[PDB]
Design a binder for this molecule. Structure first.
Ligand SMILES: CCCCCCCCCCCCCCCC(=O)O
Length: 119
């Protein structure tokens, strides 16, 4: 039971609205969601297939997403992910505040900030 569960439907709605004909932002981002300091759920934001999917807890890579495929990963509090997803804060703001850990290409999350703004 994550706070993030409350916004997944709306995110899926936005994904469904994305134009399929001209794809340009196609990163794979791993998201490790924390509660009380521990990772309790992991999901992939797959901008190639335009889907969010739950993956094995805290895993580094999977059959579908081997290491060489993953563009970036973030470890982030459940509530903070919810705040970004509801446009109340941004990944850049969380980085400024030292609230998240990012590996791989950090600019993928900053570009996601920009692309999510008007969606
Ligand atoms: C902050 C979490 C957001 C999770 C992503 C779900 C919201 C959908 C936003 C779609 C933005 C990506 C648009 C890509 C279009 C393109 O390929 O040019």
């Amino acid at each position: 039971a994550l706070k993030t569960d409350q916004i997944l439907d709306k995110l899926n709605e936005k994904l469904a609205q994305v134009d399929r004909s001209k794809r340009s932002f196609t990163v794979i981002l791993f998201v490790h969601l924390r509660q009380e300091g521990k990772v309790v759920r992991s999901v992939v934001l797959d901008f190639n297939d335009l889907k969010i999917s739950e993956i094995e807890l805290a895993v580094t890579s999977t059959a579908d997403y081997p290491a060489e495929r993953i563009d970036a990963s973030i470890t982030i509090d459940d509530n903070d992910f919810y705040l970004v997803a509801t446009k109340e804060t941004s990944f850049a703001a969380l980085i400024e505040q030292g609230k998240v850990d990012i590996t791989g290409n950090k600019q993928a999350f900053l570009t996601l900030d920009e692309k999510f703004r008007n969606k």
